[PDB]
DNA sequence: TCCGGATCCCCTGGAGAATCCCGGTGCCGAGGCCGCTCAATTGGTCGTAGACAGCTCTAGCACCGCTTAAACGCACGTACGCGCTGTCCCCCGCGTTTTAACCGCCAAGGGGATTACTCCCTAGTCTCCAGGCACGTGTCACATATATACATCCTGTTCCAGTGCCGGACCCGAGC
DNA sequence: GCTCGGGTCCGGCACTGGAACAGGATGTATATATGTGACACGTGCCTGGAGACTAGGGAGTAATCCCCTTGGCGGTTAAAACGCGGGGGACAGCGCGTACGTGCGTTTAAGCGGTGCTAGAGCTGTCTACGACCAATTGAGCGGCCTCGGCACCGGGATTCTCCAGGGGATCCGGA
């Protein structure tokens, strides 16, 4: 066959079916979604690495991740983001 | 300690001095107000970033080092403060 | 005698992959040591971001009476939200176009 | 009858003076007072290293002076010598803030 | 008498027409000729994926239309409606290139 | 084999269509050649980095990935072609 | 009892002496140089990390460092800098 | 019994530390492994850049008849070079000031 | 000067025309199903990074007391935005001619990508040592003061040309 | 017809508006003198960099293949390109009225020096929660394929936008 190539198509597909069960996506729109999510992922990971280097900490943890999303994302998007992340941490902690 | 009206703390002739450093020959009288507003917005953004850095740093004191970080991730890097 | 192979995304109750993002952080060289909860946090944030952008795009597409989302819909969605525009001011959407906007002095009397 | 310079001559003289000089044009005490005041709205009980206050000081003069040559270019572009608030709003909106 | 619209009315109509639409405005094969022409100036005999050419084409149109809306704002700011090369020279100098 | 003049291939109506997308309703005649110039400058700036990315990869054909990297380094990052 | 903070004052002072034996330096200008060298070093290092990431290389080599030098530094600075680094790595290879 | 201690910067013949830059890249987390010649190359390009900006500062200072370099001299050096301005467009120097620059229309007559 | 007709500007209506809207139709990407496989999972281990406790010291915070620098403020003045008008000319609208863009179709081959292999280099560990940093000290480069020296800038003063007009000349009319 | 006197008109002269020019005042440079502290330089050190050896693995290299890119050939037309006009916009001139510029007197608040406190910055030892490493395994995620309905294009009718050719009032000029 071919060597496997990774993408974020199916996860965004479940996300769409949660937010709008009726509608579909174009593959061009999915290419934009992959570029977007990889872009935001590398931005937040770069901020995370930056903070972890600054405070002389060898671990990356969630605390500077809230710091990074709070500094990078503006305002209400930032505090909403902190909200779902906090509750997701609560369920992940309680397994 | 607790203060109210320090946006007027940046005086009008100080803004004239910045304009002369910017090479402005004539300044309207209205100008000082929106320069105060733009200064407030800019300092507000960088100080929000700075207090974010220090709050992650578990410090009660704002350090110059984090201010350097906050400016340079904003694309306004400064040199000369150990950065 | 192993337990049933359960997934960490379901453990968070989110859809974005915990294991994939964890592996990408391990191999993206952002730290030598990675905490457990940070990929869960990041996956939740990204899933919410995708959810809200897809909500805006679907609302625009239903406004544009198209049942499949379009790059044009993505552009019109992100340019009409102020805080996302602050996030995404310096990026270009492929095949996107721009906001319909004419200046007031360009309009006739 | 006493001496009196025509308009703009003195202005050009302090233009040359402040372009030659590098010293800070903002008074330090009210500026740091405003910095403490605005920072209080984000977090209580904040303390400041002085060098932090000066670092964000030249950040302030840098951002201001940059908007001022932008505003100068906008003003001379409209064949005028006096800036107005729409000039600064134009410069900011072109810069994208 | 053959019909003729007054000037600017049709131009506003292409503004609405091309601003609603997203389809690509320049001819793609002359663009491919141009990008190969400039590309061989650095290194000889490069090969292009058509997707890469279309993507760089899209980025190029985005850059042009962005500087176009800036010079539109500048030309309005100069109390005019027609853009001239000093307007776009102003726009390039303000943006920082 | 060689090409010497393709900057004229960016025709006047294409620039007119781009300006209509920019919302310009009236275009002077002096616009077209200088827009060709600034296009030439931007294209040089991006493809130099692109071919640098390519030749470091020891390839004779550029990838679209390299074009995306060239735009994201230059601060004009592109969505819709990654992957 | 104290803990060190490292700096580049000694090296910049030395290279100042080879380029100009008779000139001085202010310490705040040396702080500016410290920020300069750290900023350029982090730019080249991050761009080197991205170049290593693109072609799936886990080892950072001088070739992509040279690539990043062409990438950031424009033209004349790039070609001369590549020249000095090339001759320098030739002496290091002979060493 | 053992070779005499002789540094790698001398092996390069450069003044910037090979070992320090090597250690910084090893703990800067830019790659899992590091080539030997890469920090040598990086120190070389850094020393060339610092060198040329030092002659620029030196002759700018000598034009002001001061033997010690000033941040004003550094700003005059960086702003009067086109390629260094392109390198350093978005950075401002503390106590840097601005170039002596008046618009021609602002002058009388 | 008032009144009445003429006329012009606005005011309106209707025809052309570009676009939106409603079906029709055929088409091809999207979603769904199925097979595969490899990366997440689970479990255990072992090391170690950070949270915490605690102590120290230092830099920031606060206060006060002078001491002027400058910010405020008033007042008079030029100059500059700016709005109107006028005048030219430049570019959009539209028509006709040209042309190469583009689809689409087919050949060919070039290098992108993959797999196998084997090895060059490098991370790691140990040991040892000298290079850079904190610290201490001194000392001349530069900041500041003071006295001249010139730049420059505005404004009074004299000069020069534009122009109205005093005197001569010419022409016209009238008296002899 | 001659001659003489007045009227009138133009040339030089004097009057007058505009500009080159000198001069004074002020502000900036510049020369000389003086202190002082920040830069530079010697010193103890210790720890991070260098040297030796090893395991092993990422990466260079060899083969291939095939897919993807390039080249080329025919048709069509939509796109480009060129010409005419003419009006809308660019732009310059002119008045004008304000709105900072400039200058001087005042208030005061910034700044500098000095003092005292401590809140927190920062360093150090412990150790434990936490998470990298590794064997077994699988089922979730990816590649391939298939079918279809959502959508692109086509076509006919409606609709709204545009713009110029007839009415309604207002105004201006001529006549009684």
Numbering used by the authors:
A (entry chain D), G (entry chain H): 30 to 124
B (entry chain B), F (entry chain F): 20 to 102
C (entry chain C), H (entry chain G): 10 to 118
D (entry chain A), E (entry chain E): 37 to 133
Article excerpt on this structure:
The individual nucleosomes adopt a canonical conformation in all our structures. H1 is absent from the stacked nucleosomes of the 4×177 array, but is present on nucleosome 1 in the 4×187 and 4×197 arrays, and is present on both stacked nucleosomes in the 4×207 array. When Δβ was close to zero for both linker DNAs emerging from a nucleosome, H1 binding was observed. We now report structures that show that short NRLs impair H1 binding to stacked nucleosomes and suggest this is due to altered linker DNA trajectories.
H1 binding to stacked nucleosomes depends on the NRL, whereas H1 always binds to the non-stacked nucleosomes 2 and 4. H1 contacts DNA with L1, the amino-terminal part of α2 together with L3, and α3 to stabilize the nucleosome and contribute to chromatin compaction.
